[PDB]
Design a protein around this ligand. Structure first.
Ligand SMILES: O=C(O)c1ccccc1-c1c2ccc(=O)cc-2oc2cc(O)ccc12
Ligand SMILES: O=C(O)CCC(=O)C(=O)O
Ligand SMILES: [Mn+2]
Length: 432
């Protein structure tokens, strides 16, 4: 395989014909004032230690990301990639003033890039021969900030198909975005084939290493845009230069099951089956109908694994730059603890003498997959909290395996390990 850069005569026509949905707006087109502001914002964020490498999970292995990052965006919004849910430090849509100022800066960059994107999307439609679709596909709700110092990496991976040289980030799609949504990236580098000292973004067609890839040089303050279905039909990578680089990558995160309001509402739905006169350990349920019980136990899993474990696995890195999620997370944990109460109440009822066996077995069938998944996912998460790299990484830089409690812990109604309970319930369902 081979690739094309601006040095190749064929670059220009290949871009024009096979990448009309890829747009580059060079530093020129962006005001010197905005450049100054976002570049300074990058630097304060970096100095206040707001960017971290994430311990992600990909095809079974636990890996530290080469880039350190932070997610900034709409209050209560989250973004899930590589099995890790990132939580926004909020930006002032309708904390220390410095970080607050930085987030404010990245909101107005967001506004600017949003405008640029709509324009580009409008011009693309005109070329191609609705109005609501365009604006919704440009309505960026988060940005993921990235930083890498390549001189800090002992060995960088070679780009494997086109001879593009050292990769800072491997070939991928930006995951979990709204369908056909645009992506906009502000790139900030500190200042035969592609120039090794300069940062590039590379593109290829999915499934395809025969059509030469493009490598687009990125100088200080250059912006690039993936429009419409480009992010889906193509992969991209980031090719490392010799100097450090920041990027701000603005996305329309698909957040239908990914906001604080969404998850609080799911919890409230679950607790509708609980007599709510008073908050104490004496949990009693309004109904034992299979469909209501299954739903309750599913919500229980959702808040435990998608929210609590995700949040705490990331070493409590937030109250550092924002306490915003601290109270929400306390609240979600209290809701989850009530639901541990619910599971116990269901279990009590299963054991009640005078419960017909047919009704018991209908209850078992309703809840068994949820409890099985709860056991398995607890194993998987506990594994993830030790692994190798978690072991290797310093004591300061370790994942927290919360919520977790000992067999002796009398504050919790059920054991953390559900193996016996699951076995027993399963056994009962095979009884004759
Ligand atoms: O880019 C990498 O090689 C990498 C290294 C360690 C951890 C994650 C990644 C990696 C990504 C890192 C950040 C990001 O925004 C996207 C990434 O996508 C990847 C896709 C892969 O197939 C394989 C790897 C990645
Ligand atoms: O920085 C870029 O150019 C794209 C960002 C990126 O590839 C990522 O880390 O998701
Ligand atoms: Mn990307």
């Amino acid at each position: 395989g081979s690739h094309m850069t601006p040095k190749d005569d064929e670059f220009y026509q290949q871009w024009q014909l096979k990448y009309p949905k890829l747009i580059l707006r060079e530093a020129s087109s962006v005001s010197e004032e905005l450049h100054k502001e976002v570049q300074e914002a990058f630097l304060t964020l970096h100095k206040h230690g707001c960017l971290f490498r994430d311990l992600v999970r990909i095809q079974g292995k636990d890996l530290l990301t080469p880039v350190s990052r932070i997610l900034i965006g709409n209050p209560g919004c989250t973004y899930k990639y590589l099995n890790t849910r990132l939580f926004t430090v909020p930006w002032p849509v309708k904390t220390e003033a410095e970080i607050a100022a930085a987030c404010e800066t990245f909101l107005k960059l967001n506004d600017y890039l949003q405008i640029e994107t709509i324009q580009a999307l409008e011009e693309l439609a005109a070329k191609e021969k609705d109005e609501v679709d365009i604006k919704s596909r440009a309505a960026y709700n988060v940005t993921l900030l990235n930083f890498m110092d390549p001189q800090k990496m002992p060995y960088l991976k070679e780009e494997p198909y086109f001879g593009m040289g050292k990769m800072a980030v491997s070939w991928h799609h930006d995951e979990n975005l709204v369908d056909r949504s645009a992506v906009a990236v502000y790139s900030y580098s500190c200042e035969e084939g592609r120039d090794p000292d300069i940062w590039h973004v590379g593109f290829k067609i999915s499934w395809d290493i025969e059509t030469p890839g493009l490598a687009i040089p990125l100088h200080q303050g250059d912006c690039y845009f993936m429009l419409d279905d480009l992010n889906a039909t193509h992969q991209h990578c980031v090719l490392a230069g010799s100097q450090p680089r920041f990027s701000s990558t603005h996305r329309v995160a698909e957040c239908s099951t990914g906001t604080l309001d969404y998850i609080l509402q799911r919890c409230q739905l679950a607790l509708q089956n609980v007599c709510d006169d008073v908050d104490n350990d004496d949990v009693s349920l309004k109904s034992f109908e299979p469909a209501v019980l299954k739903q309750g136990e599913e919500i229980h899993n959702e808040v435990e694994f998608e929210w609590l474990r995700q949040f705490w696995f990331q070493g409590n890195r937030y109250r550092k730059c924002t306490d915003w999620w601290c109270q929400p997370m306390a609240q979600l944990e209290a809701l989850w603890k009530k639901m541990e109460g619910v599971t116990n109440a269901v279990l009590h009822e299963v054991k009640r003498e005078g419960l017909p066996v047919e009704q018991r077995n209908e209850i078992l069938t309703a809840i068994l997959a949820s409890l099985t998944a709860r056991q398995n996912l607890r194993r998987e998460w506990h594994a993830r909290c030790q692994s190798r790299i978690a072991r290797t990484l310093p004591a300061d830089q370790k994942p927290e395996c919360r919520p977790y409690w000992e067999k002796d812990d009398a504050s919790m109604p059920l054991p953390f390990d559900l193996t016996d309970i699951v076995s027993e319930l399963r056994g009962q369902l095979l009884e004759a």
